[PDB]
Amino acid sequence: MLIVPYNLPLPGGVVPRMLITILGTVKPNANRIALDFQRGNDVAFHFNPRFNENNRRVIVCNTLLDNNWGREERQSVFPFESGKPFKIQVLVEPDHFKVAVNDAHLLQYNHRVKKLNEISKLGISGDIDLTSASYTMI
Ligand SMILES: CC(=O)N[C@H]1[C@H]([C@H](O)[C@H](O)CO)O[C@@](O[C@H]2[C@@H](O)[C@@H](CO)O[C@@H](O[C@H]3[C@H](O)[C@@H](O)[C@H](O)O[C@@H]3CO)[C@@H]2O)(C(=O)O)C[C@@H]1O
Numbered sequence: 001m002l003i004v005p006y007n008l009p010l011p012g013g014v015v016p017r018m019l020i021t022i023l024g025t026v027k028p029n030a031n032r033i034a035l036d037f038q039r040g041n042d043v044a045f046h047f048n049p050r051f052n053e054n055n056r057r058v059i060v061c062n063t064l065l066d067n068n069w070g071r072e073e074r075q076s077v078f079p080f081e082s083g084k085p086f087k088i089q090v091l092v093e094p095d096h097f098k099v100a101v102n103d104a105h106l107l108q109y110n111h112r113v114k115k116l117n118e119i120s121k122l123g124i125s126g127d128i129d130l131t132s133a134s135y136t137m138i
Protein backbone atom coordinates (compact mmCIF):
# COMPACT_ATOMS: atom_id res chain seq x y z
CA MET A 1 0.00 0.00 0.00
CA LEU A 2 0.88 3.71 -0.14
CA ILE A 3 0.81 6.17 2.78
CA VAL A 4 -1.81 8.90 2.78
CA PRO A 5 -1.45 11.81 2.34
CA TYR A 6 0.54 10.93 -0.76
CA ASN A 7 2.35 13.27 -3.16
CA LEU A 8 2.67 12.27 -6.78
CA PRO A 9 5.06 14.56 -8.68
CA LEU A 10 3.85 15.52 -12.15
CA PRO A 11 7.11 16.36 -13.90
CA GLY A 12 6.76 19.38 -16.17
CA GLY A 13 3.15 19.66 -15.13
CA VAL A 14 0.18 18.28 -16.96
CA VAL A 15 -0.67 18.34 -20.63
CA PRO A 16 -3.51 17.11 -22.77
CA ARG A 17 -3.55 13.31 -23.25
CA MET A 18 -2.04 12.74 -19.79
CA LEU A 19 -3.99 10.11 -17.85
CA ILE A 20 -3.63 9.95 -14.09
CA THR A 21 -4.90 6.77 -12.39
CA ILE A 22 -5.56 6.36 -8.67
CA LEU A 23 -6.46 2.96 -7.24
CA GLY A 24 -7.54 2.46 -3.66
CA THR A 25 -10.26 1.33 -1.29
CA VAL A 26 -12.57 3.62 0.66
CA LYS A 27 -12.37 3.08 4.41
CA PRO A 28 -15.45 2.04 6.33
CA ASN A 29 -17.33 5.11 7.61
CA ALA A 30 -15.31 7.39 5.32
CA ASN A 31 -15.98 11.12 5.59
CA ARG A 32 -13.89 12.47 2.71
CA ILE A 33 -11.51 11.96 -0.17
CA ALA A 34 -9.42 14.68 -1.81
CA LEU A 35 -7.31 15.00 -4.91
CA ASP A 36 -5.39 18.28 -5.10
CA PHE A 37 -3.65 19.12 -8.37
CA GLN A 38 -1.24 21.85 -7.24
CA ARG A 39 0.52 24.71 -8.94
CA GLY A 40 2.87 25.63 -6.12
CA ASN A 41 0.58 26.72 -3.27
CA ASP A 42 -2.36 27.15 -5.62
CA VAL A 43 -4.74 24.25 -6.24
CA ALA A 44 -5.64 24.13 -9.91
CA PHE A 45 -8.16 21.32 -9.43
CA HIS A 46 -9.51 20.18 -6.07
CA PHE A 47 -11.72 17.08 -6.34
CA ASN A 48 -13.38 16.41 -3.00
CA PRO A 49 -15.95 13.64 -2.46
CA ARG A 50 -17.80 14.26 0.80
CA PHE A 51 -19.64 11.26 2.25
CA ASN A 52 -21.75 13.22 4.78
CA GLU A 53 -22.47 16.84 4.05
CA ASN A 54 -25.80 17.43 5.76
CA ASN A 55 -26.43 13.70 5.30
CA ARG A 56 -25.90 13.86 1.55
CA ARG A 57 -23.02 12.53 -0.56
CA VAL A 58 -21.61 15.14 -2.91
CA ILE A 59 -18.47 15.82 -4.87
CA VAL A 60 -17.13 19.34 -4.49
CA CYS A 61 -14.65 20.68 -7.04
CA ASN A 62 -12.86 24.02 -6.84
CA THR A 63 -9.68 26.02 -7.41
CA LEU A 64 -7.57 27.74 -4.77
CA LEU A 65 -5.73 30.90 -5.84
CA ASP A 66 -3.57 32.94 -3.42
CA ASN A 67 -5.24 31.03 -0.56
CA ASN A 68 -8.76 31.88 -1.69
CA TRP A 69 -11.30 29.28 -2.77
CA GLY A 70 -13.27 30.06 -5.91
CA ARG A 71 -16.80 29.14 -6.93
CA GLU A 72 -17.53 25.51 -6.14
CA GLU A 73 -18.75 23.11 -8.78
CA ARG A 74 -20.97 20.43 -7.28
CA GLN A 75 -21.85 17.00 -8.65
CA SER A 76 -24.50 14.91 -6.90
CA VAL A 77 -23.70 11.80 -8.91
CA PHE A 78 -21.62 9.95 -6.33
CA PRO A 79 -20.02 6.68 -7.40
CA PHE A 80 -17.96 5.94 -4.28
CA GLU A 81 -19.09 3.62 -1.51
CA SER A 82 -17.56 3.21 1.95
CA GLY A 83 -15.58 -0.03 2.17
CA LYS A 84 -15.26 -0.53 -1.59
CA PRO A 85 -12.34 -0.54 -4.07
CA PHE A 86 -12.32 2.29 -6.58
CA LYS A 87 -10.44 3.60 -9.59
CA ILE A 88 -10.27 7.31 -10.32
CA GLN A 89 -9.00 8.29 -13.77
CA VAL A 90 -8.23 11.92 -14.50
CA LEU A 91 -7.67 12.59 -18.18
CA VAL A 92 -6.31 16.00 -19.01
CA GLU A 93 -7.98 17.43 -22.13
CA PRO A 94 -7.43 20.81 -23.81
CA ASP A 95 -10.23 22.67 -21.99
CA HIS A 96 -10.86 20.53 -18.90
CA PHE A 97 -9.95 17.73 -16.54
CA LYS A 98 -12.16 14.74 -17.38
CA VAL A 99 -12.86 12.38 -14.46
CA ALA A 100 -14.13 8.80 -14.63
CA VAL A 101 -14.66 6.51 -11.68
CA ASN A 102 -14.77 2.75 -12.08
CA ASP A 103 -14.72 3.22 -15.87
CA ALA A 104 -17.80 5.45 -15.90
CA HIS A 105 -17.67 9.13 -16.80
CA LEU A 106 -18.29 11.30 -13.74
CA LEU A 107 -17.56 14.97 -14.46
CA GLN A 108 -15.44 17.54 -16.23
CA TYR A 109 -13.79 20.61 -14.71
CA ASN A 110 -12.84 23.46 -17.01
CA HIS A 111 -9.30 24.78 -16.68
CA ARG A 112 -9.18 27.91 -14.53
CA VAL A 113 -5.43 27.68 -14.08
CA LYS A 114 -4.02 28.11 -17.58
CA LYS A 115 -0.37 27.21 -16.99
CA LEU A 116 -0.90 23.47 -17.20
CA ASN A 117 2.83 22.80 -17.33
CA GLU A 118 3.16 24.30 -13.83
CA ILE A 119 0.62 21.97 -12.23
CA SER A 120 3.38 19.74 -10.99
CA LYS A 121 2.05 17.85 -7.95
CA LEU A 122 -0.96 15.73 -7.12
CA GLY A 123 -1.81 15.33 -3.45
CA ILE A 124 -4.06 12.40 -2.57
CA SER A 125 -5.60 12.43 0.86
CA GLY A 126 -8.56 11.37 2.98
CA ASP A 127 -10.24 8.25 4.23
CA ILE A 128 -8.78 5.69 1.84
CA ASP A 129 -6.34 2.85 1.61
CA LEU A 130 -4.25 3.95 -1.34
CA THR A 131 -2.99 1.13 -3.56
CA SER A 132 -1.47 2.90 -6.57
CA ALA A 133 -1.06 6.36 -8.10
CA SER A 134 0.48 6.79 -11.53
CA TYR A 135 0.26 8.46 -14.90
CA THR A 136 0.68 7.64 -18.57
CA MET A 137 0.47 9.40 -21.91
CA ILE A 138 -2.32 8.07 -24.09
C1 LIG B 1 -6.35 21.90 6.16
C2 LIG B 1 -7.19 21.94 7.40
O1 LIG B 1 -6.68 21.97 8.50
N1 LIG B 1 -8.51 22.03 7.26
C3 LIG B 1 -9.27 21.92 6.02
C4 LIG B 1 -9.77 23.28 5.54
C5 LIG B 1 -10.41 24.05 6.69
O2 LIG B 1 -11.26 23.15 7.41
C6 LIG B 1 -11.25 25.24 6.24
O3 LIG B 1 -10.60 25.90 5.14
C7 LIG B 1 -11.45 26.21 7.40
O4 LIG B 1 -12.54 27.10 7.15
O5 LIG B 1 -10.75 23.04 4.53
C8 LIG B 1 -10.26 22.38 3.37
O6 LIG B 1 -11.43 21.92 2.65
C9 LIG B 1 -12.14 22.99 2.05
C10 LIG B 1 -12.33 22.77 0.54
O7 LIG B 1 -12.84 21.48 0.32
C11 LIG B 1 -13.24 23.85 -0.06
C12 LIG B 1 -13.54 23.68 -1.55
O8 LIG B 1 -14.35 24.76 -1.98
O9 LIG B 1 -14.46 23.87 0.64
C13 LIG B 1 -14.34 24.15 2.02
O10 LIG B 1 -15.61 24.09 2.66
C14 LIG B 1 -16.45 25.18 2.33
C15 LIG B 1 -17.84 24.65 2.02
O11 LIG B 1 -17.86 23.78 0.87
C16 LIG B 1 -18.81 25.83 1.86
O12 LIG B 1 -20.14 25.30 1.77
C17 LIG B 1 -18.69 26.77 3.07
O13 LIG B 1 -19.54 27.90 2.92
O14 LIG B 1 -17.34 27.21 3.18
C18 LIG B 1 -16.51 26.11 3.53
C19 LIG B 1 -15.14 26.60 4.01
O15 LIG B 1 -14.59 27.47 3.01
C20 LIG B 1 -13.50 23.11 2.72
O16 LIG B 1 -13.32 23.43 4.09
C21 LIG B 1 -9.39 23.35 2.60
O17 LIG B 1 -8.60 22.89 1.75
O18 LIG B 1 -9.50 24.57 2.86
C22 LIG B 1 -9.57 21.06 3.71
C23 LIG B 1 -8.58 21.20 4.86
O19 LIG B 1 -8.11 19.90 5.25
Ligand SMILES: [Cl-]
Pocket residue numbers: 038039040118119120121
Ligand atom coordinates in the same frame (compact mmCIF):
# COMPACT_ATOMS: atom_id res chain seq x y z
CL1 LIG C 1 3.65 22.41 -8.09
Ligand SMILES: [Cl-]
Pocket residue numbers: 112113114115
Ligand atom coordinates in the same frame (compact mmCIF):
# COMPACT_ATOMS: atom_id res chain seq x y z
CL1 LIG D 1 -2.47 30.38 -14.79
